[PDB]
């Protein structure tokens, strides 16, 4: 009884984790966004110097 109560609590925790992770997976990645932000920042600095 005690182990199955703990098991259902851990199952609820896993379902909360999956519920947040599915919403996060509707958004694009993190590191690729950092790479394209670095590229856009370099291009914006070059365009600002040209302007």
């Amino acid at each position: 009884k005690k182990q199955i109560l703990q098991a259902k609590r851990i199952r609820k925790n896993r379902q909360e984790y999956d519920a947040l992770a599915k919403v996060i997976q509707h958004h694009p990645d993190r590191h690729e966004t950092l790479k394209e932000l670095e590229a856009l920042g370099k291009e914006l600095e070059h365009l600002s110097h040209i302007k």
């Binding site: 996060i24 958004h27 694009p28 993190r30 966004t33 950092l34 394209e36 932000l37 856009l40 920042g41 291009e43 914006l44 365009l47 600002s48 040209i50 302007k51």
Partner: protein
Amino acid sequence: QRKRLAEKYRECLSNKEKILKEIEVKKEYLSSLQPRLNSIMQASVQ
């Protein structure tokens, strides 16, 4: 954090479009200035 990076990337896209608009218009202005200079040279004793 992904929300912040997505919104800041959209802001950087808008800023890059503005830099391109400034540059295009700026280039046109420069071209006009060159024509004006040419006209002045033609007008140009000495």
